[PDB]
Amino acid sequence: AGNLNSIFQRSGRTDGGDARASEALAVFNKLKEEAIAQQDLHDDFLVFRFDRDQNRVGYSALLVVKRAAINGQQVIVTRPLVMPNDQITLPTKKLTIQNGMHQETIEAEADVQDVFTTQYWNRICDSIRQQTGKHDAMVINAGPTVIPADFDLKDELVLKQLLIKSVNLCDDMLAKRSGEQPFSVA
Amino acid sequence: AGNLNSIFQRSGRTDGGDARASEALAVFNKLKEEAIAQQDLHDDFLVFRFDRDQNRVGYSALLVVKRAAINGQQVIVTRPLVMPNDQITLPTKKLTIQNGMHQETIEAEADVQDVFTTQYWNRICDSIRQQTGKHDAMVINAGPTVIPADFDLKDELVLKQLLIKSVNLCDDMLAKRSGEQPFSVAMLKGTDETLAARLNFTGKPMHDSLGYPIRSDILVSLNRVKKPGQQENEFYEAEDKLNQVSCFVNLEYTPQPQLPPLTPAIVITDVRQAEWLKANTMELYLFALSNAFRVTANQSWARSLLPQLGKVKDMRDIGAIGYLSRLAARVETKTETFTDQNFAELLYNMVRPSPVFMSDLNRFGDNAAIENVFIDALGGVNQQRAVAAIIAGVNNLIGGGFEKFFDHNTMPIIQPYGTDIQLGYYLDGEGEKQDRRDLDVLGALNASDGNIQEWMSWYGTQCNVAVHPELRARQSKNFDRQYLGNSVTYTTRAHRGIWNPKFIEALDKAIASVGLTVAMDNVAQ
Amino acid sequence: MLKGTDETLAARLNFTGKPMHDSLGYPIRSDILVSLNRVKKPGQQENEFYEAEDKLNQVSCFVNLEYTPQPQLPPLTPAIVITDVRQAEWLKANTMELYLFALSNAFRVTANQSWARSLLPQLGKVKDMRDIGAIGYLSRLAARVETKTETFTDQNFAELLYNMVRPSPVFMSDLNRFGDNAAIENV
Amino acid sequence: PQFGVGQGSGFY
């Protein structure tokens, strides 16, 4: 499929994917707009979707993105928010364990540390670049987080704060990249 | 009078449009915006209302429109969505039938085939230019389709999906005009990857973009090209499918001047790529067609004729075949004494061993941008161009060489079947939609309960094409009311044709001959 | 642009007993609607691909009566009053040329004696206002003419007109500074 | 018996 996707993903779009992830994207878009209206946040950032049916992901995620051109380099900074779902079965690792004289296998669902692999990160890089248009940009990992499966999406306050904090972490990483003067005892 | 459109349209705007085109525009604009909000759709394009009032068509439509300039030319790709309105009657056409020495005229309503004339399209193009400002633009026909009057417009899910699919196709056609790279066996032929395939004896129907059922006896599934031992793509889960072809097999009662009386007419009703792939091109279509060939070439389609033993309500029960055979009776297939061996014997005496491959062709179907080349390839002013496009599509799949199997100018790719197809659906005892095509030869024999004279009247209606099609359509509808029921809804009509056996030989052998080997999953029956 | 080699015009005079409404839904009095249509030869027409109508324009007229005693002529001098001028709904533009072409529709309302049909009695009305029988109050009779009943003849009607109404009406119009045609009517 | 042709595009 990957050899074909190179070009047959370019033409046309589809619907689908995890409904919880769609709800999460929608509540963050709502909160984003409320924050802009109340001047808690500037309208200078984008939120993208990272999703199952497009990227073969394991866990879906929302991506908070800031951009800057630093000394000629286009830089994208992002902070993913991973979304587990209690209604979705994930593939397991087959863990073969040499228990004394006999090997037994325990299977376990991949956790967020098993899913967010270097390559998962590389697909985040590429997905954002295609959604921002900055195809040759460098991408900074501002440190991902998780929005666990278990709970009501009704805590708009928490979600608003996660967005604000994600934006701030993204700004600090661009600031580091640009040489912002360090904190010091001075 | 019609030339006063040059004055009528010079300035200003008006209050107009029919109630369905008005409602349709409102829901489609809503859906566009929600798709953008959910990030499913890109915000690079426009939706337009085409009016029967403001401009020169009998039927209003919405236009799914996308644009780009390609090498200096402004190019627009449009996929019209016709909006039939149950409250609006377009003046009928006079069908004069010369019945030997008797001349009689039947008046009838224009269907989407009669409506979508060359000028209908040209008028669609002109309106778009008025609406987009691109007065010097060229417009690409992605294939008109229709969203029928009958159902309630509140199905936002389907409507969203229609926009999604229609813009997909629009992007493909801008791309293919832009010179985008073709699908090929080389992309599938990893040095470490192989194909495999199976025949699904479904027990269920499949549904088009508006949710209407499509007859299929066998769904051919071509597995994703891959091999055990290849690197696993992280923690993923996916269906191992590349594409599929939907088909059914009838048993036509055919002439002979020693063969048995029935023909294994293998009919393709639909061609789909796996859902994970977005593009819809001729190479993808053509490659998938090989799936139907293998139905009889490697495997045996006849399993689909087995009666549903133990089920009383089998309207196409093979037992009916005894009415065309020398028995003139239904074979008792309800009994514990009916065996697989007896089934095979019925077929040994009744059904011919040589398969015939044919397919539906629909200018208004889900694949209309492509269906149209295969339809024009049947004959007419541009047959040569349509044929050239089709042979080029296969050569793109194989890297050339289709021409090493046969001459396409001696052997046109698709022949006409003559008797065309009335499409529609009927409701079953629980109110579900079922394909009207169920009254096929076995179906019709059970429907008349062995009354061969009633069967033959119907059968001649479906075979003698010296009879004007209106006369045939009227009798076909009369037969559905008596045998299928009055709960029958008719939908957009379609063409049928026969795939040239040499086209088939070349497609199947050319793919195999370049190393894209496919294994059969049903290794033995 | 109208003189097609395969196109001519034709017209109809409508005598229906119903009003027109203006741009905000208010009633307009008229007796006769003059409708001018485009008639084409039955060959190939653009409308083979669509539902179509032949209306080009319309002029709405009221038939008045001016009382002109001579202390002889029939005492009432009729007039054709244009109460509205419209283009067919197919044409978005409203210009001086279009207005003037349409005005010829009022002229033709007086062909023969067609305009005088507006002076007829009509079905079953027990007491209603446009009854010609009222004319008997100005005529020698000094009485309402019994016109609404089964004993009134076509001949008696013709006689009321012969003695009371002059056969050739005056053409006139109402120009509204605030109407939809005001840009033109103001000229 | 005859084949009508509509206004197809892209492939011709």
Numbering used by the authors:
A (entry chain C): 19 to 204
B (entry chain A): 19 to 275, 288 to 555
C (entry chain B): 205 to 275, 288 to 403
D (entry chain E): 591 to 602
The authors write:
To protect themselves from host attack, numerous jumbo bacteriophages establish a phage nucleus—a micron-scale, proteinaceous structure encompassing the replicating phage DNA. The ϕPA3 PhuN monomer is comprised of two connected domains.
Flexible termini and large loops mediate adaptable inter-tetramer contacts that drive shell assembly into a largely p2 symmetric lattice. In keeping with the p2 symmetry, each PhuN tetramer forms four unique interfaces, two of which form channels: a Diamond channel at the center of the core tetramer, an Open Hairpin channel and a Closed Hairpin interface forming the lateral contacts between core tetramers, and a Loop interface where the outer corners of four tetramers meet. The Open Hairpin channel and Closed Hairpin interface are located at the lateral interface of two core tetramers. These lateral interactions are established by the same β-hairpins making contact with different residues of the neighboring tetramers, approximately 20 Å apart. At the Open interface, the tips of opposing β-hairpins (residues 111–126) interact with residues near where the C-terminus leaves the structured acetyltransferase-like domain of the neighbors. Keeping these hairpins apart creates a somewhat narrow channel, measuring 31 Å by 41 Å across the corners of the channel. At the Closed interface, these opposing β-hairpins form direct lateral interactions that close the channel and move the tips of the β-hairpins closer to a structured loop (residues 245–258). As we do not observe any large conformational changes between the asymmetric subunits, this suggests that the 20 Å shift between the β-hairpin positioning at the Open versus Closed Hairpin interfaces arises from a largely rigid motion of the entire core tetramer and thus, as a result, introduces the 10° skew in the lattice network. The Loop interface appears to be, in part, held together by interactions between the large flexible loops (residues 272–291) from at least two different subunits. We further show that the lattice assembles through interactions between flexible loops and establishes a negatively charged interior surface for the phage nucleus.
